Design a binder for this molecule. Structure first.
Ligand code: HEM
Ligand code: HEM
Ligand code: HEM
Ligand code: HEM
Ligand SMILES: Cc1c(O)cccc1OCc1cccc(CO)n1
Ligand SMILES: Cc1c(O)cccc1OCc1cccc(CO)n1
Lengths: 146, 141, 141, 146
């Protein structure tokens, strides 16, 4: 993806304040609630019967932390998102057969969570930069489909 | 199709907006225009620079329409028949652009109303905006 | 949202299907399973072999549900409540799969009813199947 | 690249029987009618007010031939779709900014048109083989988005 130097600074600054224990879990969580069909991929995650059950689920929080860690690796390697997510793409595409649309949904859900956590600090230009990043990440994960 | 709970969630959440209708609507537009530049091609005659009085006033129009949609959540096709002829028949807006704006509306609400923006309400709001989008992109007259 | 003409087109075309309901339903399913093998994962305990009796039985179930939807085109949510409680609540079907089946249904109709499958009726049927898909994929209870 | 030997054979065998002067127009025409927002991209094409106007529009049929010619070029280079549609990808993505989803819709409209013409001859295995074709074409056309 292509960020301006000002955009990269704003992205890095905000990301350094991200609660790495919760933000990922809330992102994956809201995905499973807002788009319930995504729950099918996580049968072994125990109780997902209610919104509260999903948000509070330790396996959801744990796995969401791995998702967030993937985005962190993406941010640290924006010049090579395809090579960075090559392993994950082979997993999500060849094995799990996740629809590429769901990749975009999660990226946008993360954006909502960031807005939720930072309020007015998540300005429209800040969002604009993060939309470039999540589009690049989601595109990197669907790379084995291409 | 909205549940009774969806309708309750939407009314409560959007009821918190109140006097911030124009501001939130305008902000949502600015977010869409900046995040997704191709959406600007539907507004070539518009002043789309930041702080635009035109975008500000148009944000109020969009917000009031949403408020009206909340009021007629059980009667959207008749209540929104007006905006449908505009967006589906005349403007012929690609449905993908409605997804982008809906997303930017959610982001705006999350940024301004963190206490309201629960996962359940998030879901209901998304379905509501998806519903409004379907009606405005359907030629049913 | 369907226009009066949309409703007219759907009723006239699906009426022409008649007793070929179970046949077309089964064919549409077989087209889906073969063109998009991932859809088979929703039927793990099914006999999905070519021409199997279970698939033809299921095709008739799908077709009759569609016939029911056509009769209640003005009131889909209520008429389809049960089908929306086992597609959206328990099977949590990804909406992309409904687009796949809807397509295979159109292909099946086009293959069997050449004179009926006009561009106008094509468009109306697509909207109808999209409406049914929306209802069955939504949680409104 | 995908497509099995048997799928390549089924696609080639049917395509030789295809009316290259009509199918394209029918496909583009139905795209404009079934998904009316696509009409916005063809404003200079004249009358698009009704289905009869669209299907009878000379420019729509003419452009349809061009579109179908590109599909034909794709079928002659099934192991290099992305190079075949490289130039078109730049046009549709970078210049016209056509959303990728519309690429998929046109491909499936084409599939319906093929079923409409061949009927019973358009068997499920034949359709399945063509589904991979139109998906590969849609992906190749959206390459500049990736
Ligand atoms: C869009 C950005 C996404 C990112 C960055 C991401 C990231 C990850 C990561 C880091 C893992 C861990 C893999 C490992 O430890 O070996 C993983 C696994 C997984 N992902 Fe994703 N993911 C994304 C989207 C999705 C979506 C949308 C779904 C489903 C709707 C999904 C389904 C899964 C499943 C089922 C697993 C393995 C779960 C298990 O091991 O039980 N992913 N993902
Ligand atoms: C999603 C919910 C939406 C709502 C509630 C909405 C609402 C409105 C309203 C109330 C108006 C003014 C109608 C009047 O003149 O009284 C309008 C106009 C307009 N809308 Fe939307 N809209 C939505 C989505 C969109 C999207 C996604 C786009 C394009 C990306 C769009 C493009 C336009 C354009 C180009 C105009 C005409 C502006 C002018 O020249 O005055 N709309 N809309
Ligand atoms: C127009 C679209 C559809 C209609 C009208 C429809 C209708 C039906 C009907 C009538 C049944 C049987 C209900 C019963 O046995 O009481 C059923 C079951 C089922 N459907 Fe669908 N369906 C549609 C789309 C889909 C799609 C796209 C999928 C998956 C890709 C799907 C997956 C299933 C599954 C897994 C069952 C349960 C079968 C079993 O476990 O015995 N449906 N549907
Ligand atoms: C999916 C497969 C598609 C193929 C194979 C295809 C093929 C073509 C070809 C061969 C041209 C001629 C380019 C030239 O001669 O310079 C063209 C132009 C064009 N295409 Fe496509 N196309 C596809 C999809 C679409 C879709 C879905 C849209 C819009 C929703 C679209 C919009 C256009 C427009 C607006 C032009 C130029 C029209 C003009 O000259 O006024 N294309 N396409
Ligand atoms: C109920 C629903 C969804 O969960 C998602 C998208 C559209 C949708 O319905 C749209 C619609 C069409 C016609 C009438 C009404 C209710 O006024 N809604
Ligand atoms: C009207 C419509 C579309 O043009 C496309 C997708 C969904 C849709 O509406 C679905 C819907 C929701 C609630 C009630 C009814 C009519 O019974 N339809």
């Amino acid at each position: 993806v292509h960020l301006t130097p000002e955009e990269k600074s704003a992205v890095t600054a905000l990301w350094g304040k991200v609660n790495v224990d919760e933000v990922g879990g809330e992102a994956l969580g809201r995905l499973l609630v807002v788009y319930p069909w995504t729950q099918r991929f996580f049968e072994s995650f125990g109780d997902l019967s209610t919104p509260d059950a999903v948000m509070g689920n330790p396996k959801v929080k744990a796995h969401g932390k791995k998702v967030l860690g993937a985005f962190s690796d993406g941010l640290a390697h924006l010049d090579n998102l395809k090579g960075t997510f090559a392993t994950l793409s082979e997993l999500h595409c060849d094995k799990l057969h996740v629809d590429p649309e769901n990749f975009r949904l999660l990226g946008n859900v993360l954006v909502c969570v960031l807005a939720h956590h930072f309020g007015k600090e998540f300005t429209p230009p800040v969002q604009a930069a993060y939309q470039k990043v999540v589009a690049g990440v989601a595109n990197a994960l669907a790379h084995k489909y291409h | 199709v909205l549940s009774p709970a969806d309708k309750t969630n939407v009314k409560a959440a959007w009821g918190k907006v109140g006097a911030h209708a124009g501001e939130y609507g305008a902000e949502a537009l600015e977010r869409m225009f900046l995040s997704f530049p191709t959406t600007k091609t539907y507004f070539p005659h518009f002043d789309l620079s930041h702080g635009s009085a035109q975008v500000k006033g148009h944000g109020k129009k969009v917000a009031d329409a949403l408020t009206n949609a909340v009021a007629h959540v059980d009667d959207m096709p008749n209540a929104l028949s007006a905006l449908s002829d505009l967006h589906a028949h005349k403007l012929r807006v690609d449905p993908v652009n409605f997804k982008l704006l809906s997303h930017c509306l959610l982001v705006t609400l999350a940024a301004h109303l963190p206490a309201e923006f629960t996962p359940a309400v998030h879901a209901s709001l998304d379905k509501f905006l998806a519903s409004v989008s379907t009606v405005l992109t359907s030629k049913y007259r």
